[model samples]
Target: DFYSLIPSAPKGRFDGIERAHTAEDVKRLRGSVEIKYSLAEMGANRLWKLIHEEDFVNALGALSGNQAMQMVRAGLKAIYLSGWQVAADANTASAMYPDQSLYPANAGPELAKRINRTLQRADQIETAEGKGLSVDTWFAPIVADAEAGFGGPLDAFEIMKAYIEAGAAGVHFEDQLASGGKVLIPTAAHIRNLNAARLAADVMGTPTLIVARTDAEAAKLLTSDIDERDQPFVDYEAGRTAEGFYQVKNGIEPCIARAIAYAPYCDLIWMETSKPDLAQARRFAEAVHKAHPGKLLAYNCSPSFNWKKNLDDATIAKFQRELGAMGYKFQFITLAGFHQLNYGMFELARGYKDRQMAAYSELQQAEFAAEADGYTATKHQREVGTGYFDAVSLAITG
Candidate 1:
């Protein structure tokens, strides 16, 4: 009866632990897990179905729940939680800096929960408002950045569990590391990290997707040389050091090889590049398609790019659509929120410095105009829980 009473998510590839030879050397069963139906799993399934759509899924790093709510209202189906955004917002070690993936391991999960909590609460009152429209968009699934799993396989498991428990629908980890000078881990080691995450979610009975990302495109130093597969990419330039003398060899081959190698282990694949090169991306995507046809991929449309300076008008406009055509089902502006926050603040502050209340009035006018389209920021108090508390207070006082 307890088993029967247990809930389940809609059917998905990760509904149960899978069994087969993934790495091909170790023929292992997917292992076992019991009791399903967590909100995280539900979020995972929702994301899975969304990606399966004929249209490509795209999102920006939502810096806050307020931004997330606005994004959802703008019809975004997924929310991205960027490591860079979180790090620059607040570093794990309590210092502000560029995101070398050094944010707190649990930061993404906490943000996922914060955004989800905000959205769910909004849905509560917004539904009561009876706008005669579906409030489902408010609950956009979060795809968080899990930089290098933050440690070993067990650490990967723990981190994965945290994301799932905190209602992250999906998460991604990279081959390159953070704490150890950005050198890449061994291919096999990274695979284990991916598998550890998969096993964590599987046994936990959630369909959470593990996005296996390769940073081989830009990684110079190799933290390992044990796996023969890494041999081709390894280098010995400028003498050997304690970490080893493995400088990366490249030409898109290194990144492609890693993605193909990681394909069978993860739900989605990603390649992080230093710059946006359509030719390189197309070549890599085609190479991946040649090896593992129809594999969904993720692209970090990095905010580091000088969009106006580097890309021509023609190239920039159709860039993401082009990648989608190449089978990159998910594309994200990895630090769009980080970049825009400062950009917006700078402009607003400049305007306030100049025109004072005139500029403030302009901001209010914009908010009011947006309010006609259901933007809730106009009533800042209600957006911050006043509406919810007001109802509770009324009920209690009555």
Candidate 2:
């Protein structure tokens, strides 16, 4: 038995007296499960998808992670916790703020904790054949606060710690500057932030995955702009413009170079592009692999933005194979979530307006629930742990 000054480790629900997986446990597990030999092996062997979800209702609803697992329990590999979604759903004045708003800084950690705890319970109730869900959260610093000269790397460190403490399996940090979410700075300054984030995880000795995201493509870094930072970038084709900010030229080339430079400090390299081009994706992926072999590349097929390309199953698989062939590992396509969360809510609102009432007839309600495959009234109770308390009550009474 191991003894420590700390009397005991923390326990989650259903974990009982046993401690949950600690930082050390995650570190070792990631090393064994995620580390790969070649791009082909990593792609063909460990293909997984992450579905974005915000709340318990949708998370437990028919369309999102909740129903798929209960029915076929197929296709999905993990739940991606979107900080922006959490901020939008919050009961605050700024709840309707854009995805780039600073509201996520205040709401993300709490959301991560709630999701992790729920996942923990799901793990407990799972049978031998079922697989537990993995969690990844968008972890980034508050650009607003940074612009106000109120925060820096120390704040970023604390934010990283909080996500780790909240039990996030992975976190994504973007390289955008203190402006809009899409506007990014040069690579030299971005790497400093990346280094600080890496240090935070390293010092904590946590195995939580760190995803380094570059928005160079989204911003469409033009060669005419000039970087005014104290320590400017050296490798880019820099020139002066009225914009004053140091700009990068050659589109994906600078991003590929930055990805190579930053890959050693993080687990994955996420290239955020405004437009989805398979040709550009392949070129960038190849350059990144050439610069740094055995590096995992990430692609976001998020349809929330206007610039991203829409896809069918055939195109999605084709893109996946192309990227896999080029050494990319994770590709997130969450259009299903966008459709359900937006269109589903829109229809519900129209229904409420038409009826001028919250209550519906049993027949109407059954039809509504039947819209989602394999939905039943009792499923909600099971998902929210009604049976767990019932078991506890029986254990005490018997």
Per-candidate Cα lDDT values, in order, are 0.77, 0.48
* Pairs in steric clash, model 1: 18-30
Tens-place lDDT digits, model 1, residues 1-398 = 11121135454454323323243222133233454445686788788888888468899998888888878877888899988778878444666867675666767778888888888877776665566444456678899988888889888988898888888989998887776245777899988898888767755656688898887776777776888888887665544466554666754788888888888888888888878988888898899889778778888887777889999999999998888888888888888887788998898899999999998889889989987676767888877777777777888898
Which candidate's lDDT is highest? Answer: 1
Show where candidate 1 strays beyond 4 Å: 1-37, 91-93, 133-135, 237-239
**What are the TM-scores, per candidate, against the unseen true structure?**
0.89, 0.65
Give lDDT for model 1: 0.77
Query: Clashes in model 2: which pairs?
Result: 226-245, 226-246, 227-246
What is the lDDT for 15 in model 2? 19
Candidate 2: what lDDT? 0.48
Q: Which of the numbered candidates is closest to the native, going by highest TM-score?
A: 1
